[PDB]
Design a protein around this ligand. Structure first.
Ligand code: HEM
Ligand code: CL
Ligand code: MN
Ligand code: MN
Length: 195
């Protein structure tokens, strides 16, 4: 169908734009975590009260692991972008061949499609682990704020909340990505079967 080829194309274009957005946010997140970890390190080190200290150390330890997770998250994004390039090239050739020349190309396109979905899943799980940790930190900071006031702690809290906003955005973009890929597979399977 004519609008079917159009839809696949439009979904694929949307997806390219989305993946660029996801990569960009991930860069901003990594930058963010590295900018803020120095402030956290110094808080942890300067803390005298044992309650505050064990909590700030838990948070620091987590943020240290998050650097590695953020690195792996970005590598995963790059890998997906490289697969997209292959989907675009193989996709173009599929269009050019108009259903002819055997199934090997169509199968490669399908494999790439399966494999990018797997990458997005891994990507979602990395983001989800980070988010879960960051939300746990909010509970921890709130616990040691109590009556005191804790000027510096309130600063950390504010900063952790800003990060969480970005982490939610990231997971949101991710969900949408996995949605577009499902729609691509749906529209793609139809095209193959028809023409
Ligand atoms: C089971 C999954 C999929 C199947 C069966 C499939 C099938 C096809 C077919 C038959 C074509 C040629 C249709 C035509 O334009 O005449 C095509 C083109 C294309 N596909 Fe897919 N596809 C799948 C998944 C994906 C995914 C996940 C992406 C991108 C993330 C993608 C991107 C493209 C692109 C860019 C084209 C070229 C569009 C054009 O300019 O004509 N495909 N695909
Ligand atoms: Cl103190
Ligand atoms: Mn973190
Ligand atoms: Mn945190």
């Amino acid at each position: 169908s004519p609008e079917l080829r159009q839809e696949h194309q439009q979904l694929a274009q949307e997806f390219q734009q989305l993946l660029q957005e996801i990569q960009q946010l991930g860069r901003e997140l990594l930058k963010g975590e590295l900018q803020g970890i120095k402030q956290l390190r110094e808080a942890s080190e300067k803390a005298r009260n044992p309650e505050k200290k064990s909590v700030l150390q838990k948070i620091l330890e987590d943020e240290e692991k998050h650097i590695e997770l953020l690195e792996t998250l970005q590598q995963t994004g790059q890998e997906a972008q490289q697969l997209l390039q292959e989907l675009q090239q193989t996709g173009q050739e599929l269009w050019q061949l108009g259903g002819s020349g055997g199934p090997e190309l169509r199968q490669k396109h399908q494999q790439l499609a399966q494999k990018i979905q797997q990458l997005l899943q891994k990507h979602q799980q990395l983001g989800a682990k980070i988010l879960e940790d960051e939300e746990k930190h909010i509970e921890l900071l709130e616990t040691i704020l109590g009556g005191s006031g804790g000027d510096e702690l309130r600063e950390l809290l504010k900063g952790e909340l800003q990060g969480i906003k970005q982490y939610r955005e990231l997971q949101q973009l991710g969900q949408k990505a996995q949605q577009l890929v499902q729609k691509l597979q749906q529209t793609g399977q139809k095209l193959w079967q028809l023409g």
